[PDB]
Amino acid sequence: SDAPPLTLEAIKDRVLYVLKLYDKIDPEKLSVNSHFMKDLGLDSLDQVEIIMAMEDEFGFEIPDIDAEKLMCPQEIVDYIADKKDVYE
Amino acid sequence: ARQWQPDVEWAEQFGGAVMYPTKETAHWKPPPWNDVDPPKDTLVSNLTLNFGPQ
Amino acid sequence: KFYIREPPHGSPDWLKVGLTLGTSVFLWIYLIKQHKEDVLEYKRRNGLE
Amino acid sequence: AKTLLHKYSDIPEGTECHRKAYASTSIGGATGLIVSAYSIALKPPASFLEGVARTGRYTFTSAAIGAIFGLTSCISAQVREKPDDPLNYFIGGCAGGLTLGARTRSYGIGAAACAYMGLTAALVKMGQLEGWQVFAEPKV
Amino acid sequence: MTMMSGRPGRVPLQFLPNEARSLPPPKLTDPRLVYMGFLGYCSGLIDNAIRRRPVVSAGLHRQLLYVTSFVFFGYYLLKRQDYMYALRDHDMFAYVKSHPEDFPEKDKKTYGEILEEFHPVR
Amino acid sequence: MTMYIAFILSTIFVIGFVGFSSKPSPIYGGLGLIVSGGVGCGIVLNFGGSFLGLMVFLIYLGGMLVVFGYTTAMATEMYPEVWVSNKTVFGAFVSGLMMEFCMVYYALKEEEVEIIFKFNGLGDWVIYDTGDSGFFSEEAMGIAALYSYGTWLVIVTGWSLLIGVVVIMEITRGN
Amino acid sequence: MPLVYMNIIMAFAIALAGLLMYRSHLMSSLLCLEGMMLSLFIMSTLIILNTHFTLANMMPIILLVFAACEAALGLSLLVMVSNTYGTDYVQNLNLLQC
Amino acid sequence: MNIMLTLLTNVTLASLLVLIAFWLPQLNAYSEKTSPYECGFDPMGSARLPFSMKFFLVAITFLLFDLEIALLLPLPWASQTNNLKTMLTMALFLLILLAASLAYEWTQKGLEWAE
Amino acid sequence: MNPIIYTTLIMTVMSGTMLVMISSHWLLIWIGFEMNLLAMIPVLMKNFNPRATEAATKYFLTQATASMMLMMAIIINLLYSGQWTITKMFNPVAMTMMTMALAMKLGLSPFHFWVPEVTQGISLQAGLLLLTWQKLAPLSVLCQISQSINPNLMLTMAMLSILIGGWGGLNQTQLRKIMAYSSIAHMGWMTAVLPYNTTMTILNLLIYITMTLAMFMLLIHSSATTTLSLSHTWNKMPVITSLMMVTLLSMGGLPPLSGFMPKWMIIQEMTKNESIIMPTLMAMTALLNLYFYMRLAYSSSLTMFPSTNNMKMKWQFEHTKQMKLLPTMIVLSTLVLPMTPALSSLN
Ligand SMILES: CCCCCCCCCCCCCCCCCC(=O)OC[C@H](COP(=O)([O-])OCC(O)COP(=O)([O-])OC[C@@H](COC(=O)CCCCCCCCCCCCCCCCC)OC(=O)CCCCCCCCCCCCCCCCC)OC(=O)CCCCCCCCCCCCCCCCC
Ligand SMILES: CCCCCCCCCCCCCCCCCC(=O)OC[C@H](COP(=O)([O-])OCC(O)COP(=O)([O-])OC[C@@H](COC(=O)CCCCCCCCCCCCCCCCC)OC(=O)CCCCCCCCCCCCCCCCC)OC(=O)CCCCCCCCCCCCCCCCC
Ligand SMILES: CCCCCCCCCCCCCCCCC[C@@H](O)O[C@H](CO[C@H](O)CCCCCCCCCCCCCCC)COP(=O)(O)OCC[N+](C)(C)C
Ligand SMILES: CCCCCCCC/C=C\CCCCCCCC(=O)O[C@H](COC(=O)CCCCCCC/C=C/CCCCCCCC)COP(=O)(O)OCCN
Ligand SMILES: CCCCCCCCCCCC(=O)SCCNC(=O)CCNC(=O)[C@H](O)C(C)(C)COP(=O)(O)O
């Protein structure tokens, strides 16, 4: 059989793991609701790198629009779920 | 009032690549209607050569 | 009535019909003759008549 | 090969149960090795250690089935003082089937295997007694 | 195992040895020949039906040719079959006659001297 | 026991066979097959078959040239494999070498039936001919008899070669 | 038999085994096929020379001819497979199942 | 024996020349010196990439035409047979068949290289 | 492909088979096999596509391996007895290798994997040729050496072929794979009686060839390669589906149909030896082939499946090409049992 039926929870753990793998974000201060621009003190260029890391982790490309407006991990998780049509 | 005959739901049992599907063979695809698979874009890269300056 | 020639016309193909009938009659007469000679040869070999 | 078959079949029925059990274990181990070889060839196990594990599992299952069959068959034959009786082979076959059921952890498999192996072993004993030939030589 | 493949005097691709001419030919009203003609008629009917023609009336010349061809082949087929069976019987009898030790005719016993066990049904 | 030349040549034949059977790379496999063709030419030469040995060597040289071109065209990758660049290829190569050495020792020190029959050795000089006659080569006369005795063979061979040309044209047509 | 006969038969068995176990390249298996042909040529030539069978000296040439036909056939099929996939890997020939 | 000695001598002389070439002079090897030559600029890809063969069909035909050479080589000995009419018919039959195969491939554009 | 080239290739295939059948020299038999394979490879690729190319490659690899083993067995036989004539095969190892090579050529189990794959990958005409004409040469060679054959190996492979044919056919919705598994089982039946009587092998081969030709011609007439595409044929040509149903019943072995005759005669011949258990298992196993033939009959003839709107346009047109031998093939496949004693002319 193919890969297991990916759920919201696993998506969240993978997103959080990728984010704490980023050397410019302290792990303990990061939350699923932290805002990259204000809470994490990350600039626009930094955000582009985070989106590319998400692209590598989840194996699909996010256009310049779409990806640009994801400012915190929850929006990334929601976008990934909506693209993959995952409801659980 | 009339004899039962197979419908679409009955007919769809025989439409798969295999009978008695399993977890391994549930992803097998039936062959195309004509026996022509779509052509893969296996591009062959041309050789790149420096002709000069030496 | 038909829109097109429908090559087999109202009259039958006389060449093919004649060939078929001739083949059938030739085979029938050949079989009759062969059976007659076979009977004669069998009667001669065993000396019945 | 037929060397193992002759080694098993040369010993009389209700005598020397340990040697008969040893021969049956050898036959079962050979069968399990062949089965695992075909299974590995047609279904690659994705890892060398996993292939070793599958080979060991199949071989041990077959060897245990053979050992149990031979041991209980010979023990019944010598206890009842009734050699050349198919019931001993039936008992051995059902014991081997229950061994298979315990080995796969399944009650239905155990019951079906008991019944079918017992019947097959009894049939084999009847064939030995009456001279039934699986592969008859051409006679006419 | 081939019983008749290499029998002495056999001509490779003859289909009808001269020895076969000493046997009575099958009668033209042989029921086997009639069955072959029935097979040819069935072939003609199926030919009519497959081509979407009136099954019974479409081609009488074609149906006649079908029946005639089947009968013609069947006649020679029957001749060869009868020849083969005659050969088998001839060889059997010759072998029995030439090996008297293997086929003994032992003494006949009447039922008044043979002891048969009686099994009651009750 | 006389100089063991034929035995050494046959051992090198087996070694080249193991070399290309381990399948390291097509470039290397062709080299092994060339070495095998050379030693086989030598083995046949040592038995009186000069023409056949030279012919098979020439044929396999041409075949391996075509194979080299085809390997460069269709059977390459960034890092071609050698007999020590991969555990699978090295394992197959070492296993073949050890099987050959085991069989040689087994048949040389003992007199045993490997699979078919037994063999004690003594060198292949023993079964030779001591035949004393002729202004001609018997092998040459036999091969030349293809044009007087082998008419049927010539017919079927020529037809098969013409059909092979037609067949390769049909196969590579594509569309 | 002498040692040379066993060596040639061992070479044939090794080439057959080589053909049976595929790695990745199709061309390697074709090479194993040619190796079997060469081994058969050598064995037949040795047997025919040893027994002084004069008219049998021409069979190995016929064997070589049909070996060449077989190799040409295999190479053509390889050309077609490579044109389809850009690679001669046997892993790509998996469209048809049992 | 003599031919084996000749082969050994020639191979030994070539090997000794290579050995002298590699052990006599002064060696100063460094990475730039040993890099691949492409007219002064670094190569783009690898030389191990597939290299297309435009004459692939002629190469396969060479395999078949090469085996007819092995069939024609015994001809000098075949001319000594008593039945010269059968042999001459068979020699011409083989050569006519070989010319027909060339004529077929020529007319079907099999000799043209792929573009 | 040029029609002239196609006709030349077909004649070369048949010439290789006839050379196998008429030769007395092992070298000529091997040459016949080589010629047959060389001409057969392009016929499989007549309609060029990746599936046809894959089928041709697999076929070539299998048959080239088989011919290599064939030649090695011949050479071993020559070594132990300087004989080129096709006879009792004086060496047992050579006979074992010869049996395995011929089994590989025929597609008998264990070496049966290639047949379903090559049959599914080629066209119905190529499948017809592959499953009918390509059985003649290996079977003829096996018939000529039947005395030296080892019953234990041949019977093992025959029983395995019957079992695997039934089990594999049980799982198929593609018609070509069903035909291939049916072919495997019938090859098993053919080779089971070979050590006892070659006339029965010939009779079974002829009856199987007739039924296979009828089935393939019916499938070509109604252009169906899947079960669902065959389920539409009733709404276009019901007579074709009825004839196919009767032929499928005949293939199953049900009396009074002609299909039953080879199985009956083989069972009788095997009981003329001692051989009681083997025919019983063979019949019980052929019940599986009967099962999937019956499933095909349910899908195509005994029930009516839903159709599509565009079939109305097809109703207006007739079949252009006509197969002249199809009625005779159907009649021979169905109504031939009363002529059973005519098998005496086969020996
Ligand atoms: C034509 C007219 C009609 C004919 C046809 C119709 C009639 C015949 C067919 C219908 C009946 C046949 C069915 C046979 C059993 C089927 C088993 C099954 O389906 O497995 C799948 C099914 C699936 O299970 P699973 O998925 O593997 O795991 C979940 C389990 O359910 C979870 O399991 P659990 O945790 O709930 O506990 C299971 C455990 C414990 O079970 C329990 O929890 C409750 C306790 C029940 C155990 C009963 C044993 C103590 C009571 C017996 C008292 C004496 C017996 C009567 C004779 C009296 C004599 C005067 O059971 C065991 O550990 C088994 C150990 C062995 C002890 C029982 C076997 C005794 C053998 C009988 C000897 C008879 C010899 C002949 C005597 C001649 C004189 C008349 O297994 C079960 O759930 C059933 C478990 C119990 C089965 C054993 C019961 C034996 C019944 C008598 C058998 C005799 C018929 C066959 C004779 C031929 C053989 C050579
Ligand atoms: C054992 C003892 C002897 C028995 C021998 C064996 C049995 C008899 C021989 C069998 C072969 C002979 C016929 C072959 C051609 C039939 C093909 C056909 O389609 O027929 C339609 C055709 C009607 O077409 P039409 O008249 O042109 O216009 C209506 C449309 O065509 C309307 O047509 P449509 O296409 O539009 O209608 C569609 C229909 C069309 O589908 C069919 O018509 C099915 C026909 C299939 C032919 C059978 C297959 C091949 C033969 C194997 C038989 C095996 C028998 C062994 C037991 C197993 C049972 C199967 O399909 C369906 O409705 C699907 C229904 C699904 C039912 C599935 C059952 C089918 C198999 C049954 C076979 C039973 C035996 C033959 C039955 C009689 C057939 C006419 O029937 C006929 O009119 C001809 C039958 C009568 C001819 C014989 C009369 C001889 C002359 C009278 C004088 C007697 C001389 C006495 C001498 C003494 C002086 C007085
Ligand atoms: C499903 C129905 C099966 C039908 C099969 C086809 C029927 C039509 C084919 C017509 C056959 C034409 C051949 C006859 C022309 C002359 C050729 C003749 O010389 O061949 C002889 C051979 O004769 C033929 O074999 C006879 C063919 C007749 C086949 C029909 C028997 C079918 C069994 C019973 C079913 C009923 C059939 C009804 C038909 C309508 C040579 O004998 P021989 O060279 O020494 O044997 C070689 C094989 N050996 C040595 C190994 C034994
Ligand atoms: C849907 C339900 C229908 C089930 C019916 C199936 C049961 C049929 C009964 C068994 C049939 C097989 C018997 C074989 C035919 C008998 C012919 C015969 O006499 O052969 C014997 C040999 O007898 C046998 O070999 C038979 C052995 C059995 C082999 C197959 C076993 C089949 C299953 C056995 C148990 C099932 C039978 C009862 C089932 C009852 C209904 C469920 C004589 O052979 P010789 O060797 O010449 O004797 C002296 C020389 N030694
Ligand atoms: C391996 C070595 C190779 C290295 C060579 C690479 C070559 C470099 C090419 C340079 C291209 C340019 O200058 S591109 C022009 C760059 N400048 C502008 O765009 C003006 C506006 N500045 C801003 O928007 C922010 O300062 C910004 C930093 C962009 C963050 O953006 P956010 O506020 O939206 O996060």
Side-chain angles (χ1 to χ4, degrees), chain A residues 1-43 45-81 86-88, chain B, chain C residues 7-8 10-49, chain D, chain E residues 2-122, chain F residues 1-110 121 123 125-175, chain G, chain H, chain I:
Chain A
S1 186
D2 300 337
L6 187 62
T7 71
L8 275 280
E9 189 59 1
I11 287 180
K12 191 198 307 223
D13 322 267
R14 308 223 279 161
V15 168
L16 262 306
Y17 176 54
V18 166
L19 279 166
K20 51 186 68 194
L21 250 169
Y22 195 27
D23 271 86
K24 296 231 270 303
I25 292 181
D26 46 5
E28 57 264 15
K29 176 150 190 3
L30 151 69
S31 76
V32 86
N33 273 294
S34 285
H35 198 253
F36 302 124
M37 313 304 176
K38 333 273 191 54
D39 315 4
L40 306 184
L42 302 179
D43 63 67
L45 279 193
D46 286 23
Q47 198 275 2
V48 176
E49 306 173 65
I50 284 169
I51 287 327
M52 263 165 318
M54 291 321 145
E55 274 187 320
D56 296 343
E57 168 72 26
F58 279 85
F60 81 110
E61 45 154 344
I62 316 153
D64 207 305
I65 72 149
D66 280 359
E68 183 202 347
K69 62 206 171 182
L70 319 165
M71 310 281 47
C72 58
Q74 191 54 53
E75 324 212 51
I76 297 167
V77 173
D78 299 342
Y79 178 92
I80 292 177
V86 175
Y87 298 74
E88 294 205 278
Chain B
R2 68 185 176 189
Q3 245 216 334
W4 175 92
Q5 289 302 346
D7 60 7
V8 171
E9 195 220 12
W10 178 275
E12 289 169 336
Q13 309 162 6
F14 314 93
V18 86
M19 303 258 192
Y20 322 128
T22 69
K23 298 172 157 14
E24 304 86 275
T25 73
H27 317 279
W28 284 13
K29 288 302 333 313
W33 303 112
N34 57 351
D35 320 317
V36 182
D37 300 80
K40 292 180 171 65
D41 45 357
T42 73
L43 54 98
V44 46
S45 66
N46 300 130
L47 182 52
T48 302
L49 184 74
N50 275 319
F51 198 91
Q54 203 274 296
Chain C
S11 294
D13 189 342
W14 298 110
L15 190 75
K16 296 208 68 175
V17 165
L19 284 198
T20 307
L21 293 152
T23 314
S24 323
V25 184
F26 163 75
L27 280 166
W28 267 112
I29 65 110
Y30 193 91
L31 180 71
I32 298 284
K33 189 224 227 313
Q34 171 87 56
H35 177 259
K36 176 244 315 203
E37 325 203 317
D38 279 1
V39 162
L40 282 192
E41 232 280 353
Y42 150 77
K43 240 176 270 213
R44 179 193 137 300
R45 280 200 191 195
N46 296 258
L48 303 307
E49 302 300 329
Chain D
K2 292 198 296 183
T3 57
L4 297 175
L5 214 57
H6 267 155
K7 280 190 188 72
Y8 172 86
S9 101
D10 279 359
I11 324 174
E13 295 295 328
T15 66
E16 300 180 354
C17 290
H18 50 293
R19 312 201 20 221
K20 220 159 185 54
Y22 183 83
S24 295
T25 319
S26 325
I27 294 173
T31 315
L33 271 195
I34 293 164
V35 170
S36 60
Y38 268 111
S39 173
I40 280 171
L42 293 171
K43 288 304 174 305
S47 177
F48 170 84
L49 276 206
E50 170 157 351
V52 179
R54 188 199 290 170
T55 304
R57 182 163 86 242
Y58 288 7
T59 313
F60 183 63
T61 295
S62 325
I65 290 179
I68 301 297
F69 161 80
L71 189 70
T72 83
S73 212
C74 178
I75 278 177
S76 147
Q78 72 147 249
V79 154
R80 291 161 35 101
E81 301 137 38
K82 272 184 164 311
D84 320 310
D85 172 51
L87 185 59
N88 306 325
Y89 267 35
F90 178 82
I91 282 140
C94 177
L98 292 172
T99 299
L100 173 62
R103 199 61 177 78
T104 70
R105 270 295 65 221
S106 197
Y107 278 108
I109 277 157
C114 155
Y116 294 145
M117 307 216 210
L119 223 163
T120 318
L123 285 178
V124 163
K125 181 41 94 155
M126 302 181 191
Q128 297 195 231
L129 293 173
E130 310 268 320
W132 303 340
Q133 312 168 19
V134 178
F135 290 117
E137 261 275 316
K139 290 185 41 196
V140 288
Chain E
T2 341
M3 210 175 74
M4 314 280 280
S5 190
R7 184 178 173 267
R10 174 162 172 159
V11 174
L13 292 155
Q14 218 173 15
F15 185 89
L16 256 169
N18 198 255
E19 184 89 280
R21 311 241 288 161
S22 153
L23 293 160
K27 287 142 73 122
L28 281 193
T29 36
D30 199 302
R32 298 170 291 171
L33 259 183
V34 184
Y35 189 77
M36 310 273 329
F38 164 75
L39 294 178
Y41 183 70
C42 286
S43 298
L45 290 187
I46 285 169
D47 199 319
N48 271 340
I50 284 182
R51 253 91 154 182
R52 307 201 56 244
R53 303 193 277 240
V55 167
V56 174
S57 299
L60 294 199
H61 56 300
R62 263 190 299 259
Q63 291 170 236
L64 181 67
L65 183 51
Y66 266 107
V67 169
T68 308
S69 305
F70 274 69
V71 169
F72 191 76
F73 172 66
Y75 181 76
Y76 293 101
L77 190 59
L78 290 186
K79 259 159 78 195
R80 183 167 164 75
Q81 156 195 351
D82 292 352
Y83 167 67
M84 299 315 279
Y85 282 123
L87 265 198
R88 173 205 62 182
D89 280 44
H90 191 262
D91 287 331
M92 177 181 342
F93 287 130
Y95 193 88
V96 173
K97 183 230 199 63
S98 72
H99 293 83
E101 49 283 7
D102 297 313
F103 303 95
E105 287 292 332
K106 79 188 301 178
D107 53 339
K108 305 286 191 177
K109 246 174 109 193
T110 42
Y111 277 114
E113 313 140 347
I114 302 186
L115 187 69
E116 310 200 89
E117 176 49 330
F118 167 68
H119 303 276
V121 173
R122 49 161 169 243
Chain F
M1 317 75 144
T2 43
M3 323 192 63
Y4 306 103
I5 286 297
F7 171 73
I8 293 159
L9 287 178
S10 55
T11 307
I12 301 170
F13 190 77
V14 173
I15 288 174
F17 264 64
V18 169
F20 74 73
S21 279
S22 47
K23 304 185 287 283
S25 176
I27 296 285
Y28 292 105
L31 178 132
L33 196 39
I34 282 151
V35 170
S36 295
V39 278
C41 172
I43 295 160
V44 176
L45 250 54
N46 271 309
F47 272 75
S50 207
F51 182 90
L52 284 180
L54 285 174
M55 203 57 260
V56 82
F57 195 36
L58 186 61
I59 291 310
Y60 272 79
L61 286 162
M64 273 330 94
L65 177 127
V66 171
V67 162
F68 174 92
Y70 264 59
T71 302
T72 289
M74 279 152 258
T76 36
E77 67 289 295
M78 179 123 69
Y79 306 112
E81 289 152 332
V82 304
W83 291 279
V84 301
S85 86
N86 202 21
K87 48 119 190 183
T88 300
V89 176
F90 188 77
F93 187 82
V94 159
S95 146
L97 277 188
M98 182 90 183
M99 201 95 266
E100 163 68 5
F101 285 24
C102 216
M103 189 218 70
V104 161
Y105 211 75
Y106 189 166
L108 196 49
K109 260 62 188 167
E110 325 174 71
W125 64 284
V126 306
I127 41 60
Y128 262 55
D129 56 327
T130 187
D132 288 11
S133 288
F135 257 113
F136 46 72
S137 173
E138 183 212 315
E139 184 211 339
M141 303 302 107
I143 291 179
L146 171 69
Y147 287 97
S148 57
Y149 288 72
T151 303
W152 191 227
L153 277 172
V154 166
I155 289 171
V156 297
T157 300
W159 177 248
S160 69
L161 285 160
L162 181 82
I163 280 307
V165 164
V166 172
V167 150
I168 63 177
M169 308 225 54
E170 282 314 313
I171 283 167
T172 49
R173 179 193 281 300
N175 305 153
Chain G
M1 295 144 36
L3 254 294
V4 282
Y5 284 2
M6 311 207 135
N7 266 342
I8 304 308
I9 293 171
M10 180 92 242
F12 174 86
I14 288 161
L16 180 58
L19 173 55
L20 295 179
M21 324 193 211
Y22 290 78
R23 292 204 48 236
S24 226
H25 290 293
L26 181 63
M27 179 93 72
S28 306
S29 302
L30 300 186
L31 284 187
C32 289
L33 263 177
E34 319 217 43
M36 285 189 260
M37 263 312 210
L38 174 68
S39 167
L40 293 168
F41 176 97
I42 298 296
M43 191 80 222
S44 63
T45 296
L46 289 194
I47 292 160
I48 288 159
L49 289 180
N50 182 64
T51 57
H52 295 256
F53 196 147
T54 309
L55 277 172
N57 275 110
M58 62 154 96
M59 171 257 320
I61 301 288
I62 308 302
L63 204 74
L64 276 181
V65 164
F66 284 93
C69 297
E70 205 137 275
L73 200 58
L75 280 185
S76 298
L77 287 166
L78 190 139
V79 170
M80 280 321 104
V81 167
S82 189
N83 280 344
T84 291
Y85 296 105
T87 300
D88 74 324
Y89 284 166
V90 293
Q91 298 100 293
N92 295 135
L93 315 164
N94 62 329
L95 292 173
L96 315 159
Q97 302 87 45
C98 294
Chain H
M1 183 48 63
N2 276 357
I3 186 77
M4 305 204 248
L5 197 48
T6 307
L7 293 169
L8 173 83
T9 305
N10 296 341
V11 173
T12 296
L13 179 128
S15 292
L16 287 194
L17 281 195
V18 158
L19 206 79
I20 292 173
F22 266 101
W23 282 87
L24 178 59
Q26 183 75 78
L27 303 195
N28 179 26
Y30 56 88
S31 308
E32 278 284 290
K33 181 171 296 187
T34 64
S35 40
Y37 168 81
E38 204 155 302
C39 295
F41 281 99
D42 277 292
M44 215 222 69
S46 174
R48 294 291 188 244
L49 290 166
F51 194 71
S52 194
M53 209 209 257
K54 300 304 165 181
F55 51 91
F56 73 97
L57 190 55
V58 193
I60 302 184
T61 312
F62 168 78
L63 292 173
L64 299 184
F65 285 16
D66 209 4
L67 254 294
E68 327 213 26
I69 296 330
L71 290 176
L72 293 171
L73 283 187
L75 272 178
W77 295 298
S79 291
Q80 315 275 341
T81 188
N82 284 358
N83 39 321
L84 277 179
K85 261 166 199 93
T86 304
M87 157 266 170
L88 184 57
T89 304
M90 293 306 125
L92 299 169
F93 168 87
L94 219 55
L95 280 164
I96 283 159
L97 262 283
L98 174 56
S101 74
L102 177 72
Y104 178 77
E105 178 166 313
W106 188 336
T107 56
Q108 307 306 301
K109 295 110 199 53
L111 296 173
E112 280 44 65
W113 291 20
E115 313 283 326
Chain I
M1 191 216 267
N2 208 5
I4 307 166
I5 297 321
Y6 188 54
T7 318
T8 305
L9 291 175
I10 297 303
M11 287 176 262
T12 310
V13 171
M14 288 150 98
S15 282
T17 294
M18 296 313 285
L19 190 59
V20 173
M21 280 207 183
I22 72 155
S23 302
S24 175
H25 201 290
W26 272 117
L27 175 67
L28 267 301
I29 282 147
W30 185 82
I31 286 162
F33 279 120
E34 307 299 290
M35 179 179 309
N36 180 273
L37 168 65
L38 175 74
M40 269 280 317
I41 290 304
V43 167
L44 306 172
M45 309 174 65
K46 206 219 178 180
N47 310 90
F48 178 70
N49 62 68
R51 270 157 197 262
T53 305
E54 187 206 307
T57 305
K58 289 177 168 177
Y59 188 71
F60 163 80
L61 289 165
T62 300
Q63 304 300 305
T65 311
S67 77
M68 285 297 72
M69 278 145 69
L70 170 63
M71 173 45 69
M72 179 79 271
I74 290 164
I75 289 169
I76 291 172
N77 190 66
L78 175 81
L79 169 70
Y80 279 91
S81 82
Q83 298 316 315
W84 287 111
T85 316
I86 171 153
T87 41
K88 203 215 187 322
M89 185 105 53
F90 306 91
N91 198 253
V93 165
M95 182 60 177
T96 297
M97 272 256 291
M98 166 80 58
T99 294
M100 291 168 336
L102 289 173
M104 204 166 318
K105 272 188 190 304
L106 274 165
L108 290 173
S109 288
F111 331 90
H112 69 272
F113 301 97
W114 69 265
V115 194
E117 293 156 13
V118 173
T119 305
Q120 172 66 20
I122 61 186
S123 75
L124 284 173
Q125 289 87 0
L128 183 145
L129 197 69
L130 171 88
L131 291 188
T132 44
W133 182 267
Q134 290 298 97
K135 309 303 184 189
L136 298 177
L139 275 168
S140 55
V141 175
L142 275 172
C143 280
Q144 299 194 60
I145 62 177
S146 175
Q147 59 291 329
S148 72
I149 211 85
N150 177 210
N152 295 28
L153 181 64
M154 188 63 69
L155 283 157
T156 303
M157 278 188 310
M159 185 90 240
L160 285 162
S161 301
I162 294 162
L163 283 162
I164 277 155
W167 279 328
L170 266 197
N171 205 21
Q172 308 308 137
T173 70
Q174 302 297 308
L175 305 180
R176 288 175 277 187
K177 301 173 89 176
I178 284 149
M179 293 312 290
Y181 282 110
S182 183
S183 194
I184 293 164
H186 277 86
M187 279 331 102
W189 271 88
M190 268 160 218
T191 51
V193 82
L194 181 77
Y196 307 106
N197 197 334
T198 59
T199 299
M200 302 294 162
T201 311
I202 295 167
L203 171 76
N204 193 352
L205 170 73
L206 289 183
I207 284 150
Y208 155 85
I209 281 173
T210 298
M211 297 199 280
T212 308
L213 284 172
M215 206 36 84
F216 262 105
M217 281 159 93
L218 291 163
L219 287 176
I220 291 166
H221 191 278
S222 64
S223 301
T225 48
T226 72
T227 304
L228 279 198
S229 64
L230 185 64
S231 63
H232 286 345
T233 307
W234 78 271
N235 213 33
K236 167 73 195 150
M237 312 143 308
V239 167
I240 296 300
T241 42
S242 306
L243 299 165
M244 185 181 297
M245 192 259 321
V246 188
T247 306
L248 283 168
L249 287 184
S250 193
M251 287 166 73
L254 300 172
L257 307 179
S258 63
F260 174 73
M261 172 203 305
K263 317 255 154 293
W264 176 21
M265 302 310 273
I266 289 179
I267 282 172
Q268 177 220 20
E269 198 69 25
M270 291 171 96
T271 61
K272 260 143 163 63
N273 318 107
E274 314 299 345
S275 192
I276 303 292
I277 295 154
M278 188 105 186
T280 321
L281 283 291
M282 300 169 36
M284 293 294 120
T285 317
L287 284 186
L288 295 168
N289 298 60
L290 179 58
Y291 185 88
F292 58 75
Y293 298 144
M294 277 298 305
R295 173 208 278 145
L296 211 43
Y298 278 2
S299 99
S300 66
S301 171
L302 295 165
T303 61
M304 318 166 138
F305 275 45
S307 187
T308 48
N309 197 71
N310 290 342
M311 193 64 70
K312 293 183 179 61
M313 203 170 302
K314 296 198 179 198
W315 293 348
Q316 300 189 29
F317 300 87
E318 306 271 333
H319 213 253
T320 45
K321 187 72 209 176
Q322 311 282 46
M323 293 148 288
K324 191 54 154 173
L325 275 196
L326 186 46
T328 304
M329 235 45 78
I330 289 156
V331 169
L332 288 190
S333 295
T334 37
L335 314 162
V336 99
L337 195 75
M339 308 309 294
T340 309
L343 74 96
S344 187
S345 71
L346 278 180
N347 56 43

